[PDB]
Swiss-Prot record, chains A, B:
Binds 1 FAD per subunit. Belongs to the class-I pyridine nucleotide-disulfide oxidoreductase family. It comes from Homo sapiens. Catalyzes the reduction of glutathione disulfide (GSSG) to reduced glutathione (GSH). Constitutes the major mechanism to maintain a high GSH:GSSG ratio in the cytosol. This is Glutathione reductase, mitochondrial. It catalyses: 2 glutathione + NADP(+) = glutathione disulfide + NADPH + H(+). The lineage of its organism: Eukaryota, Metazoa, Chordata, Craniata, Vertebrata. Keywords: Acetylation, Cytoplasm, Disease variant, Disulfide bond, FAD, Flavoprotein, Hereditary hemolytic anemia, Mitochondrion, NADP, Oxidoreductase, Redox-active center, Transit peptide. The gene is GSR. Transmembrane segments: none annotated. Its EC number is 1.8.1.7.
């Protein structure tokens, strides 16, 4: 039984970040990883997604070429070219992460970890035992798929993982789900030329975002050529002579349900949720608490219910983002190895960018959330809607919408929501301002940068 | 003699902003404008410049098309197409500004104003007299050109004004100056296909910016195909059979001076400075103080040396930006018509974006300035340099450099300097944070947005 100061199960964002900081602090750490280092973000998430987004962005910009004084650009996007380049780049990152671990003197234990029956918390990987007084579970999650029992033929569809395996651009694609991943995938496939449908159970996407954003985002998708199938769900999927045939039920409220067949589908992409990876951990041997989806339950300090066992990142099921897993993993290392007992991540005011077209940036409370927290009488919002100057000379148009949610007399900024060209890079510093507790006067007292989109947020009235 | 509450001379950024706010406050105002409303920013500055920048940005992005999986885009940029569209857009803005004035009930007096000999400050426009207890001079500036006495043939060159009159893309262009305008023009002309040279008196451009930025900016220009002629200046210009011939002296220190002829020049663009527009105002009839360049001298509240006479914007020669003129003009209206005596613009921490390729964003003190303000022992900087993820798959490359200047033990953020893709939209919120007095912990405690360039500023170590 090899003993370490810190054993981290999972070599993705949270697990690596935590292991690296711990090692800086003098800890003797080891990371168990059964697949590729970098985990979801590098292999099948953040990185490959962004590359595909940059590609889709090229496609749109190329539509404006002639408007800008150039000759029309004519053609066909070649999926395999970019796919090969994207894979290579992921390969480069995996090699860097491995090197980062080595330079830090962190041991990499390759294989699938599981807890043992042993009294003092101990794991087994490939027959060998490993123990530490602090063990971090950072095993992440996976895409959720429907059971054949509920939706026959569901296994004919792919997930976001399968999306990163595709080698040709699917001619006809149907995406099921209304969350950010669904939105992102629909936007990429459509911009690159796939005849794309997005099938959502209600009338808008991103229903948990501020309502200005869910409305605007739904319209932008339609305007970009994505067919949004509202109040619809899949009833069955079948393999026809040439592709898939999707049977769906559309049930608009105030109307009779109607069943429709969608034929000749090349790609059926389930983007319905993520499930935690805890199933094969043998958690029950230690009696570690999970919720009914399999998420590990933790407190504000990432503690599980068992002493010396922690969990961070996707596996915990809250704020499923690369930077949160990293920040939580880091704060945890400072708490354990630097003896900073108050060291923990604040889960409020975490900013998010959704890589739609145009991108979305959000931080803090939606208007409804502020209304429930402070009361209608105490909430004031400011908003603007305009066409960015980039489109002054284009036939194709996109809008920029921004909304500021203020609370109390002081007009504290408690929420910022926007969608528009450049909003992906614009959000970070306002997130800093929001975290510091800025009020509207603080924004108003900052001299604008002209001509930009960003200047609209400091000149709202 | 028609009397008003407020008479504003100049209908550009500062003059309009001040007049509009004053009118909201109940003032009976009139704006004197001898040319087009909107003044420099709309007609020959900010707006038309940005449109030309967006165009140049299209040209660069089109170089990456094939790398992104598309077929090579082949050609020739058509200057007149975009020029016509740009003019139209400026026409649209002029009509809006005029309407804004009318809706506000501000009187527009068309013509050239000059002060009179009269005791109580009074102006004359087209034979008629006008007076007010508060008169704002906001007459802006103009491009500076060399005297034929010092540089013979200088009048064969054009200025940034003339740039906006061009109808064809000049084949060979030489830009003289090393400030932001020179840099911007060089970058646009070059990206659009002009064989461009930038002639600077020293070895770097933007010598007043933080030294990381002047160095990086000079390299980016060279990398983009702009020939930077260092330690050079124009000695004479002459009209040859086919274009202009520029005689220049290059005097590298530690070397003998060398004279060179630059032949076949289509466009010689002077971007050497701006001069205030005060010459024809008859300021001396009121004894209003100017410096030796013709700038009107004012105090912290925009007061001139004469009671009831103020000046804002370019004419004052400090912080020559559209938003500063606006903010100063607004604060002034609140002071005069809302009786807010402490109402004035803080000229510290004004953010600037330079529309180079990639763009530059700066706010606060350069490293040297912080060193002079706090002492070397009290200044700590953090910086990063990386290749944005956008170029992971391109043969063409650009860099992103960021620098954070902190002061004292607390590591107050006193300067942010960066150059890179997306830095034009990234700066605004960090400018808010800097204005609020953020420290490095405030940045560090803000969760990053992945994957973006902006996230680098919150993860500096
Ligand atoms: C398509 C997609 C796009 C996304 N886009 C973004 C985005 O743009 N921005 C953003 O912030 N977030 C994004 N996310 C979310 C972000 O990628 C995740 O929140 C983050 O990767 C979670 O990190 P983690 O450390 O919890 O787990 P992960 O990186 O999944 O790492 C878990 C690791 O544990 C390994 N493992 C699991 N069980 C075991 C075991 N028993 N033994 C050994 N090893 C094990 C797994 O192989 C894996 O390598 C995206 C996610 C997806 C799916
Ligand atoms: C090429 C270029 C690019 C620029 N790019 C940017 C940028 O991207 N961002 C930015 O922030 N700034 C930029 N600037 C600077 C910005 O445009 C100026 O700081 C701003 O326009 C100054 O406004 P102002 O109100 O002082 O004067 P102006 O807008 O020049 O207005 C002065 C007005 O007074 C009128 N006038 C003058 N004398 C008289 C008189 N006697 N009687 C009646 N009317 C009179 C003039 O016709 C004019 O309309 C740029 C400038 C230039 C030249």
């Amino acid at each position: 039984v090899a003993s370490y100061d810190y054993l981290v199960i999972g070599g993705g964002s949270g697990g690596l970040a935590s292991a690296r900081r711990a090692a800086e602090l003098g800890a003797r750490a080891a990371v168990v990883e059964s697949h590729k280092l970098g985990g979801t973000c590098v292999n099948v998430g953040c990185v490959p997604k962004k590359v595909m987004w940059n590609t889709a962005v090229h496609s749109e910009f190329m539509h404006d070429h002639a408007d800008y004084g150039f000759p029309s650009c004519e053609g066909k996007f070649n999926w395999r070219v970019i796919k090969e380049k994207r894979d290579a780049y992921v390969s480069r990152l995996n090699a860097i992460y491995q090197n980062n671990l080595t330079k830090s003197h962190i041991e990499i234990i390759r294989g699938h970890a599981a807890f043992t029956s042993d009294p003092k918390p101990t794991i087994e990987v490939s027959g060998k035992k490993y123990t530490a007084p602090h063990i971090l579970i950072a095993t992440g999650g996976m895409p959720s798929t429907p059971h054949e029992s509920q939706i026959p033929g569901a296994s004919l569809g792919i997930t976001s993982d399968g999306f990163f395996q595709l080698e040709e651009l699917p001619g006809r694609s149907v995406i099921v789900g209304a969350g950010y991943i669904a939105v992102e995938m629909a936007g990429i496939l459509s911009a690159l030329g796939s005849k794309t449908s997005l099938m959502i159970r209600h009338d808008k996407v991103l229903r948990s975002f501020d309502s200005m954003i869910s409305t605007n985002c739904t319209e932008e998708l339609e305007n970009a050529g994505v067919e949004v199938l509202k109040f619809s769900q899949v009833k069955e999927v079948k393999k026809t002579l040439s592709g898939l045939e999707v049977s769906m039920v559309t049930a608009v409220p105030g109307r009779l349900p109607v069943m429709t067949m969608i034929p000749d589908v090349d790609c059926l992409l389930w983007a319905i949720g993520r499930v935690p990876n805890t199933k094969d951990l043998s958690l029950n041997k230690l009696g570690i608490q999970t919720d009914d989806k399999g998420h590990i339950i933790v407190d504000e300090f990432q503690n599980t219910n068992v002493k010396g066992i922690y969990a961070v990142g996707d596996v915990c099921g809250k704020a499923l983002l690369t930077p949160v897993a990293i920040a939580a993993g880091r704060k945890l290392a400072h708490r354990l190895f630097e003896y900073k007992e108050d060291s923990k991540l604040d889960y409020n005011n975490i900013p998010t960018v959704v890589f739609s077209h145009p991108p979305i940036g959000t931080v803090g409370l939606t208007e409804d959330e502020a209304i429930h927290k402070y009361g209608i009488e105490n909430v004031k919002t400011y908003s603007t809607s305009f066409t960015p100057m980039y489109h002054a000379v284009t036939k194709r148009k996109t809008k920029c919408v921004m909304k500021m949610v203020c609370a109390n007399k002081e007009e504290k900024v408690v929420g910022i929501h926007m969608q528009g060209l450049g909003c992906d890079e614009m959000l970070q510093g306002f997130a800093v301002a929001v975290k510091m507790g800025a009020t509207k006067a603080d924004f108003d007292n900052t001299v604008a940068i002209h001509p930009t989109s960003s200047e609209e947020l400091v000149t709202l009235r």
